[PDB]
Amino acid sequence: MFMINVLTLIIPILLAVAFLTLVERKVLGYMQFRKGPNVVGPYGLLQPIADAIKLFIKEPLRPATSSISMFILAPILALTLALTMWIPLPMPYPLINMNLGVLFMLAMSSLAVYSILWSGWASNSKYALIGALRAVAQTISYEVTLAIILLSVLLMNGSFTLSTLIITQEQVWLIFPAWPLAMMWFISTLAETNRAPFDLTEGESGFNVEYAAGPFALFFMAEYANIIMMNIFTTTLFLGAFHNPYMPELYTINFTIKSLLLSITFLWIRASYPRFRYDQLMHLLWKNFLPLTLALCMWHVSLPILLSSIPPQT
Amino acid sequence: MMTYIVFILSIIFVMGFVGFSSKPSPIYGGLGLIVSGGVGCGIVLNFGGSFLGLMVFLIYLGGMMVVFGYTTAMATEQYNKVVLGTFITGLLMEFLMVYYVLKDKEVEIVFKFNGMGDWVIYDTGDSGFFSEEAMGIAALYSYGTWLVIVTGWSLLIGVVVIMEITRGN
Amino acid sequence: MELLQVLKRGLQQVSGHGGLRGYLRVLFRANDVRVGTLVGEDKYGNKYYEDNKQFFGRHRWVIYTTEMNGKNTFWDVDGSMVPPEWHRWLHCMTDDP
Amino acid sequence: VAAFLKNVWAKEPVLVASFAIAGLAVILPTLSPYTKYSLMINRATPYNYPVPLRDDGNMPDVPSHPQDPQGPSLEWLKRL
Amino acid sequence: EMVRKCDPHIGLLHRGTEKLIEYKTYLQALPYFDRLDYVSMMCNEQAYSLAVEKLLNIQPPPRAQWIRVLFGEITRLLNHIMAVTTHALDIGAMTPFFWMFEEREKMFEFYERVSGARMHAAYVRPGGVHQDLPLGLMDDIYEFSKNFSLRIDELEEMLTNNRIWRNRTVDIGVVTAEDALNYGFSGVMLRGSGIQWDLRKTQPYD
Amino acid sequence: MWFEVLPGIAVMGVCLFIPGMATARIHRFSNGGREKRVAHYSYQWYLMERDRRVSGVNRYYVSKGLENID
Amino acid sequence: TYKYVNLREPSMDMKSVTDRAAQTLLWTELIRGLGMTLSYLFREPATINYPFEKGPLSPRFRGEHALRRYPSGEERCIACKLCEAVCPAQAITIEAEPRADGSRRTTRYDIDMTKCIYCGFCQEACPVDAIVEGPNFEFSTETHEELLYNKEKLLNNGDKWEAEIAANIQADYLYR
Amino acid sequence: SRGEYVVAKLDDLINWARRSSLWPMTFGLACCAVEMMHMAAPRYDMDRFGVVFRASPRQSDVMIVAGTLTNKMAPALRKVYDQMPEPRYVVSMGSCANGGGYYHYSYSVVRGCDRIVPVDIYVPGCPPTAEALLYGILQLQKKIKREKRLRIWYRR
Amino acid sequence: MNLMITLLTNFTLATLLVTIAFWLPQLNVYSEKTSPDPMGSARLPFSMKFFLVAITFLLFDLEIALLLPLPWASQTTNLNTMLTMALLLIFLLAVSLAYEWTQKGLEWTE
Numbered sequence A: 001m002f003m004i005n006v007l008t009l010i011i012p013i014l015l016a017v018a019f020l021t022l023v024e025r026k027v028l029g030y031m032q033f034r035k036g037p038n039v040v041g042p043y044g045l046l047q048p049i050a051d052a053i054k055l056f057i058k059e060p061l062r063p064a065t066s067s068i069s070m071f072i073l074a075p076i077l078a079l080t081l082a083l084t085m086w087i088p089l090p091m092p093y094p095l096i097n098m099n100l101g102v103l104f105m106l107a108m109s110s111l112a113v114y115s116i117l118w119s120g121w122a123s124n125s126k127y128a129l130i131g132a133l134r135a136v137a138q139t140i141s142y143e144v145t146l147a148i149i150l151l152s153v154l155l156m157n158g159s160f161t162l163s164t165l166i167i168t169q170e171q172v173w174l175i176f177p178a179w180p181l182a183m184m185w186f187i188s189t190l191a192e193t194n195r196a197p198f199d200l201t202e203g204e205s206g207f208n209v210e211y212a213a214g215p216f217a218l219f220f221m222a223e224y225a226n227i228i229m230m231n232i233f234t235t236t237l238f239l240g241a242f243h244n245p246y247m248p249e250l251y252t253i254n255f256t257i258k259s260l261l262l263s264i265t266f267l268w269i270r271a272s273y274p275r276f277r278y279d280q281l282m283h284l285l286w287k288n289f290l291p292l293t294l295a296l297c298m299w300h301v302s303l304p305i306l307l308s309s310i311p312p313q314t
Numbered sequence B: 001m002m003t004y005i006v007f008i009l010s011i012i013f014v015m016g017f018v019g020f021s022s023k024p025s026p027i028y029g030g031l032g033l034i035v036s037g038g039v040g041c042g043i044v045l046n047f048g049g050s051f052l053g054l055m056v057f058l059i060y061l062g063g064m065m066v067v068f069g070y071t072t073a074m075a076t077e078q079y080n081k082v083v084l085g086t087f088i089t090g091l092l093m094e095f096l097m098v099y100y101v102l103k104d105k106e107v108e109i110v111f112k113f114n115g116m117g118d119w120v121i122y123d124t125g126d127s128g129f130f131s132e133e134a135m136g137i138a139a140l141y142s143y144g145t146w147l148v149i150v151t152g153w154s155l156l157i158g159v160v161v162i163m164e165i166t167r168g169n
Numbered sequence C: 001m002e003l004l005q006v007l008k009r010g011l012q013q014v015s016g017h018g019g020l021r022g023y024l025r026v027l028f029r030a031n032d033v034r035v036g037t038l039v040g041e042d043k044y045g046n047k048y049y050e051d052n053k054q055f056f057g058r059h060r061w062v063i064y065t066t067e068m069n070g071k072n073t074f075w076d077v078d079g080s081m082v083p084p085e086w087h088r089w090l091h092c093m094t095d096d097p
Numbered sequence D: 001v002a003a004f005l006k007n008v009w010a011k012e013p014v015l016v017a018s019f020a021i022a023g024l025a026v027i028l029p030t031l032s033p034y035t036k037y038s039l040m041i042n043r044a045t046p047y048n049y050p051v052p053l054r055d056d057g058n059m060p061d062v063p064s065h066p067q068d069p070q071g072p073s074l075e076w077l078k079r080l
Numbered sequence E: 001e002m003v004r005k006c007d008p009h010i011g012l013l014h015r016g017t018e019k020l021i022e023y024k025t026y027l028q029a030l031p032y033f034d035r036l037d038y039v040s041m042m043c044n045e046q047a048y049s050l051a052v053e054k055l056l057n058i059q060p061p062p063r064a065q066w067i068r069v070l071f072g073e074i075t076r077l078l079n080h081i082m083a084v085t086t087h088a089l090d091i092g093a094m095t096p097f098f099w100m101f102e103e104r105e106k107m108f109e110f111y112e113r114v115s116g117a118r119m120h121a122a123y124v125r126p127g128g129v130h131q132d133l134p135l136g137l138m139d140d141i142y143e144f145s146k147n148f149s150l151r152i153d154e155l156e157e158m159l160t161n162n163r164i165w166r167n168r169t170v171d172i173g174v175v176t177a178e179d180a181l182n183y184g185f186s187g188v189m190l191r192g193s194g195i196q197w198d199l200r201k202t203q204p205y206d
Numbered sequence F: 001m002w003f004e005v006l007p008g009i010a011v012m013g014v015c016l017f018i019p020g021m022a023t024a025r026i027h028r029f030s031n032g033g034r035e036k037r038v039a040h041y042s043y044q045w046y047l048m049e050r051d052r053r054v055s056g057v058n059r060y061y062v063s064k065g066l067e068n069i070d
Numbered sequence G: 001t002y003k004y005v006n007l008r009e010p011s012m013d014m015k016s017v018t019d020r021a022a023q024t025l026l027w028t029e030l031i032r033g034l035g036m037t038l039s040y041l042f043r044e045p046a047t048i049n050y051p052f053e054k055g056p057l058s059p060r061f062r063g064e065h066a067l068r069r070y071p072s073g074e075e076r077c078i079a080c081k082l083c084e085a086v087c088p089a090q091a092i093t094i095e096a097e098p099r100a101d102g103s104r105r106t107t108r109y110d111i112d113m114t115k116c117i118y119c120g121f122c123q124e125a126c127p128v129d130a131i132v133e134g135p136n137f138e139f140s141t142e143t144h145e146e147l148l149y150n151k152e153k154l155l156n157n158g159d160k161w162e163a164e165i166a167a168n169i170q171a172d173y174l175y176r
Numbered sequence H: 001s002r003g004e005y006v007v008a009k010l011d012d013l014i015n016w017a018r019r020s021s022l023w024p025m026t027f028g029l030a031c032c033a034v035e036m037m038h039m040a041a042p043r044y045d046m047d048r049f050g051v052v053f054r055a056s057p058r059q060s061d062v063m064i065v066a067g068t069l070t071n072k073m074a075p076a077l078r079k080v081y082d083q084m085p086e087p088r089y090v091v092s093m094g095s096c097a098n099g100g101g102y103y104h105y106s107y108s109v110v111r112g113c114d115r116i117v118p119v120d121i122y123v124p125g126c127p128p129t130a131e132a133l134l135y136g137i138l139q140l141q142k143k144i145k146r147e148k149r150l151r152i153w154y155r156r
Numbered sequence I: 001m002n003l004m005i006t007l008l009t010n011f012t013l014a015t016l017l018v019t020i021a022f023w024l025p026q027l028n029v030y031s032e033k034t035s036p037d038p039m040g041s042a043r044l045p046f047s048m049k050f051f052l053v054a055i056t057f058l059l060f061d062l063e064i065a066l067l068l069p070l071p072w073a074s075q076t077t078n079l080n081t082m083l084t085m086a087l088l089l090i091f092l093l094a095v096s097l098a099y100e101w102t103q104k105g106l107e108w109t110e
């Protein structure tokens, strides 16, 4: 009975990321005065199926890897931490109701970089190793800023429970008292998933270029699942919906619409700006984002004390 | 066999230590340490330490072992009998302890160890409307003023020391 | 509301292809369902349509025949199936069909 | 002083905003009259059991019933 | 992360064009100049035509002179659209590449309606132009250029005031005026360094 | 025109609406037609175990009311 | 006769510097770029439906080569070898001999379509308008030797595309 | 029989999947690359056919040789072709890639790219128009559609 | 037991997908390739900046771990002491950041 719940959680994730590839192509194309795929299916609805069947019957590369264990294990960890990370999400009721769901998601965010590191190490090309090192550094820096922003927002919330965020946002959204934290959180989640304008491996090498068509597809599925879930996390954290305990479908429809709009905003940001340099995004974090994060952390530590606005523990 | 779950987890824990006590390679040693850290987080999860288990996942694995493997990737350039030998030896002694303490239920090496499950020594009470370990950590600012002061000064001094000694001039 | 006008335009686009079956046929063959003034048809069965309301490039089009010279071209439409006398009109070399 | 402040507001607005927010956070609790309300809100939360005292014979301030007029009141928290 | 030496290796597109010119007549050597700079096609025809007409001691008719300059400026719009949008495409701003290439396609219709080929026209020839403008061509040129000032503004909105684009370009490749002349730089490379020089203003043609 | 991208967004919205509706319906089905009980602390778990031990069915969701007293 | 791009001195008063600080603290120009892209989303795309729709072309278009005929059946080419003398890529090979009735006609007329640069010098050097560049461009093959046209292939192309080539010549020949 | 029908339907399915998701790897050598980018423009829009724009050579299906292949360049082209996963196809676009074109008699120009790599579709022109290259891509899709790999495997 | 079941299900789906992706076209028949990147012969040179930002991340992560239990700690009774210690922790974090800023620590990876 519970395995039915697990399957109905994990199979729509794969369907959603395939049609997210389709939606990305269509929305990106319509924003630059052309169309997306509309030939393969009716309005291109059969495009992800054709792409999947094409990618699963292509000849594997078989690179001359130094180690085969890390080469196998990097997609394993990537897909596992992409799919495990969806379970404490309160939509409006979570699959696993946990006391420290935010800390759980932050722990898997910190743990997800080993796929990049092992993919960079397993490839025999040292240029791929350099690219993997740069991607790892970017991910851990924005992990730091994600942790501080999450700490301040939860200090407004008062507990690490993810379902309590619906209760604390019943009157007004948290984007109204925490819009600088909202903006910086959105940019940090953009830079976490190697999303434009923070991707580097596409510009002048990639860490996962040596993988076959299948493992590259699995890395793509993991990355796009991370993108969708991060948008859902931003929706739950800052733009919470009205929840009726007798009609959960109202909350489901509302936050689904909001997270769809946020994912469309991700694709919209992808097609508007040039790429950052590596040192420029390091400058953006360590010299611009971090001082404001520390200042707003002090402000949100002191603000409930001076306003008699301390939230309950339970 | 379910009631020995923590004990079962503990086996994998010490098994993971023989993964890196033999020292095959820094990447494989890091992988063994990652497995051992996850198993230890599960062990402390089964005792009620949820915040400390997520401290293990967030700070040990995702914070420090990431830097360890990141520095490993800048050394031990990519391309034994002793590694497999001590791995087999350690596994054999470990299963000898397992078999003996599952046979006669009371062994000793340095201290007397009991062969029952971990569930016996648990508490029968309820903590109420709070987690005791959560408020124990939360008392870091209310009670541990001196500890906070010395830890913060240590971290600041560590930052100064780290950026000083790698200048080379 | 002018969205009612858009929905009405879609409904006459559905009804202008001789029903739902013809609408789905032209949708799955041409990936396009707009109706236009029938300029004519040749001996091979290709139907040539015009619609001056569209912008330059989409104002003239052709629906290819299903069988040409004994070859089943229901799905295998070809750009070289147009005869030259209609090839001059279709490529906007002249106004007169 | 005013020339320096306008200069750093011209070159580095991010640091100016961060320092202003930090200074506000460090000087505002000492001036707002609502910190004591936070203190007695945190004091009034009943995490434990209010274990009763044995009546020796002379305790006029302690109540004999929960609904008695004696003991602390909570009308201020009800109104605020 | 810094660069201390750059060694560009060329010769991957050495077709040996100027040896093949010696074995062909002056009319046959004209389409060779179309394929040298394949985004400035009609401008390279004019440079070759002006050299042959100088040696022939003849001059083009006044109407042909105005067509060459008019199609020279359309060619300048063709190159600058390619030189800017693909410059942003390599940087990462891929979106204005598709907007301006629709305007690049409309100017390709002007080439093919006057010469017959979309890109390599072989239109400007020594002595004038090969064929006259067809009827109604200049009406379409006026209709295109009337709306084109809006298209530059849309690209200018995406890049000029954008802080990411400036950070990639504010202090990159600074060249002095004295070193630009000695290194044989010309065009925008001299012009961007503050040197007041233009061949259409200093040594004018037709 | 721009509304041709809407079938993909509709499919994605259906696929994202499915897990929440499924979780809510499974929770209501497996817990006697009501919400799944949240046990975040030991006191709530003690209450849940007391209901399970008092129901006589070894099911906590079978709530015994005032009919079970003398 | 010259203008100074990027020689602007920004104002140092409090209003302009506060506007600049608000611009770099609230991301005004990034919102401007987002608004530009969002406005460009709701425009009708310029994508045509190939092969059901074709791009616009002029009757001067130079595509596939063809050999024309007189309106009596007699072929126009009289083996004068001007096209092979003017061809810059040397794609044309001509061999000629008098036929049975004594006319000057070709016996071999090959055009190497992989050498030809599609420049139209042959159709403008022909004194009888025999060789022409037709309007066809969808003639890609699967084998290299299929792009080596002989006299028979060019005559078949002329007989296939005469009904359009004659109209194009009629519409264009006054400019020549 | 049953097996012949099953392998025929499976061959049709894999043929549709391969031909409807072509990922090209262009070679930006010369003029014909500019015309390729004009085919990728919003007017003609290769991307609506499932044919993505500027795919990586490590995951691409079809290689489009657009430009002049010189003697200094051909080993790099052969290396790129050898490092491409099967099934792979080569499209020669323009006169330079087909038979040398204008520079056929040059000392440093490979007379046709078919001497280095096997070519499936020859697109003629100088440059061939964006409609012509799109027509060549569609003809390659038709050529992939009538493949008979599983029928040959079952018959052998 | 639910979390362990979910973890095992995610892990087994991941390895099933990896095995399918790594072995399904292996049964096809193709032709092999020879054993042969800009820096194949050159050794990898060490860069101090990447290691420096790694250790800076580690130290800031440790101070983040120290700063984390503030939501639980805000419910205390010594509110003045808790506020003072929280502000002191964030102030020492900012002091470490500013000292790394001043001594050219964030150079070329700013």
Ligand code: SF4
Pocket: G083, G086, G087, G088, G089, G090, G091, G092, G111, G115, G116, G117, G118, G119, G120, G121, G122, G123
């Ligand atoms: S178009 Fe030019 S290159 Fe082609 S056959 Fe004619 S003269 Fe030769």
Ligand code: SF4
Pocket: G076, G077, G078, G079, G080, G081, G082, G083, G084, G094, G122, G125, G126, G127, G128, G129, G130, G131
């Ligand atoms: S120029 Fe004309 S008449 Fe002369 S040989 Fe060529 S095709 Fe024949």
Ligand code: SF4
Pocket: E035, E038, G117, H030, H031, H032, H066, H067, H068, H093, H094, H095, H096, H097, H101, H102, H125, H126, H127, H128
């Ligand atoms: S075939 Fe013509 S257009 Fe293409 S690269 Fe060669 S010279 Fe340029």
